[PDB]
Structures are given as C-alpha cells and as structure tokens.
Paper text:
Here we investigate the mechanism of fast inactivation in the Shaker Kv channel using cryo-electron microscopy, mass spectrometry and electrophysiology. We resolved structures of a fully inactivated state in which the non-polar end of the N terminus plugs the internal pore in an extended conformation. The N-terminal methionine is deleted, leaving an alanine that is acetylated and interacts with a pore-lining isoleucine residue where RNA editing regulates fast inactivation.
After refinement using C4 symmetry, the cryo-EM data enabled us to determine the structure of the WT Shaker Kv channel at 2.73 Å resolution, which could be further improved by separately refining the transmembrane domain to 2.67 Å and the cytoplasmic T1 domain to 2.98 Å.
Author numbering:
A (entry chain A), B (entry chain C), C (entry chain B), D (entry chain D): 83 to 91, 96 to 194
The structure:
Amino acid sequence: PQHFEPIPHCERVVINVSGLRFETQLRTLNQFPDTLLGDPARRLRYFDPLRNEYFFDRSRPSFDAILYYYQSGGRLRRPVNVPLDVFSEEIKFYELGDQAINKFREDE
Amino acid sequence: PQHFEPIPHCERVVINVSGLRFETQLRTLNQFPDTLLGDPARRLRYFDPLRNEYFFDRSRPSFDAILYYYQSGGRLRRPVNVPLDVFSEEIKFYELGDQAINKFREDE
Amino acid sequence: PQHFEPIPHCERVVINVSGLRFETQLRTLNQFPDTLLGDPARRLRYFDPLRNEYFFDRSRPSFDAILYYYQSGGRLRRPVNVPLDVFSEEIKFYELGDQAINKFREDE
Amino acid sequence: PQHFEPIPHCERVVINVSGLRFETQLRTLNQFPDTLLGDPARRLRYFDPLRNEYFFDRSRPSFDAILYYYQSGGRLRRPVNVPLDVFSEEIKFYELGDQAINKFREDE
C-alpha cells in the first residue's frame, strides 16, 4: 500500500495530449520500463520531431491519471470524471502492464 | 458498442474554446461529415484568419466531450461536471447529427 | 427558463484567473452592465497594463461558471467541484447583481 | 469560520505543477510563513533558475486546493476529484503546518 515518488534534482519531456501539455522529468517515465511511455522504442512514433514534444490525440482528462501512475510510482486510480470504458481503453493503449491492468481492474 | 479511434501517422488544427486550446488532426474532424466541425463550410465562420485557429466563445468544460466524440469515433457521453441543459445546448450548437442527438438523449 | 448567448461576428479580452487564461469578446461582458466585469470602472483596477489582460488572484475553478454567466446570458450555476461557500464568496466578489445573487441562492 | 483573501495593488511568481502553470503574487505565499512555499529557503530547491518559475513534478489536480489555501488565507479543503490518499501525501509534501494538517484531517 506504499509507493515511491521521484524527487527532483534530470531531462524534462513535454507530452501534448490533444492540446493539454504535460511536463515531467525522464526519470518519471523511466520508473516503469516496458509500457508505451517507458521505453523510447514504443514512444518514438508519437514524438513530434519539430515541436520537441509527444503528441497523443486522445482524451485529455485521462492522462492526468496516466501521468500520476508514473509520478506516484505505481498508483493507478481512475479519476471520477471519465467513464470506466474510456479509462480502460486509455490504459490499454498506453500499455501500463498486464499486472498493472489486472490490479486496476480488481480495484474497480 | 464498439467504435474506432484515429491512429497517428496529418494536418493538425487548433480549436480555442474561450481560452482553452484543443489540438487535433484534421482526420479526427473528417470522421464525421456534416456537423459544424466536420465540414469546412460550417466552420469557416468560427475560424480566426489571423491566429490560425477556431474560436468558440462557449462553455470550455463541454468541448472535452465534444472533441472526444470525434476522437472516439462516435462515443458521445456527457461528463459529470456540467448539467444536461448546458450539454444539450452545446451539442445542438455543434450539430452532432439528428441520429447522434437522439442517441445521446436516449442514453440520458 | 430561456437565455440568449452571444453570436460571433468584436474586441476580445483575456482574463487571467491565477494562471488560467480565459478569452471572451467584450460583447459577452457588455451583456450585463453593472457588475465587476461589466463596466470598465470596476475592472480597471484588475487590468494589467503591460500584458493587456485582467488578472484575478482567486480560485480558478470558479471563473468557469462566472464566465458562463456572461456567455449563457444569465445562467448562473455552481459547478460541482467547488463548495457553496467558495462560490458564494466568488460571486460576491464579482458582484453579479443583487437579483442574480438572490436567484442563485434560491436555486441552491 | 472566516478568512482573509489578499487584495491586489506586488511581485508575481509562476508555479509549474507538471505542466500546469499557476500565477500568484508573492504576498499570497507570504501569508503563511513556514511551509514549503512560504519561505524561500524551502522553495529554492524547486525553483527553476532558467524559466523563472517553480517546477513541481506532482499531481496537478491537487495544487488547485494548495494554492487556494494561500489565496483564501487558511481555507484548506480537498476538491472532490482526487482521493483522500493522494491529497494527504500532497499536503504532507508542501508542509502546510502541523496545525493545518490536523485541522484538515479533523475536517475529513
């Protein structure tokens, strides 16, 4: 029931979820290897080479919880502003991990 | 009960809903012909020629659901932060389609 | 139970509520004379002469409803993300009008 | 049951909570000495010297209440969009004060 959250001081990345910009350090994304955002191989497709940011044309009220999963170091909880289906599709897209997906489902 | 969401790679448009900026690809808006945002004829009035963006002086907490309708490929659901009257007026303004309007009403 | 919302085409003003920027036309603000935002006399104090915007160091989740009152042409309603006390203090500060204040109180 | 909120006119600071920018006057932060944001000693670590802003890689839906605590002059209350578990860790990080933390818990 306890998780670790990254402390500041290195490299900061900007994630643009359909106009909503999110800024986090790379160490936040590197906490969880695998996943769409964890490794550069599965996030090079969504990286815009000109704006120096990651663009996702998806629901913006969900990346608040998706980002907090990396920040909180494992706390995945759906905010009560979006349906369960929408968040399930979002977490399936971001590939948070089979164990994490099952844990979230059992928490719902 | 299933819908299709656009995949990334072309042209991206900025929609400014009373200060809240939304960025989506043109393919997201072109999923639904007709509608205010689907075709250029009904959205040239709201396009600002100088800022290169679409300005709508309306309720900003509703275009989250309006935009997701294009992103989710047909999923129109009202977020629980605005009343049914406000969202009904918004969807009537954006002209989401008589079938879509009736489907949303029967879902409420 | 019916209200009128301004149509687009003149001058647009930016209202910065503690970092959250809101853009509306003057016709939206001029719908209600009196009030803090309706007349230039009661909003010159909060106007930043350098950034060409109005700054209010107040709760940002309330100006969504405060702004919609001008947009919707008289529809004042508290969103369910802030308490009644906070919204009452906000509407008292913005001076929405004694009749409007009483109408909102009787609607709560 | 009454609190004082700062009036405008001096120095304004920008707080970037994981991409979400908050702007407040320094007098808002100086209302409460001690705390992470009250004194420069405990906020120099989180100040970005290049962007001239304070960066916190934490949950952005929680700093609305943390900022309002300084604005409202002592009104600390968790918005109903984030869990009590998440907010308790947030207020502990910002070190709102031993009396204030216990007051919030007794209010929950």
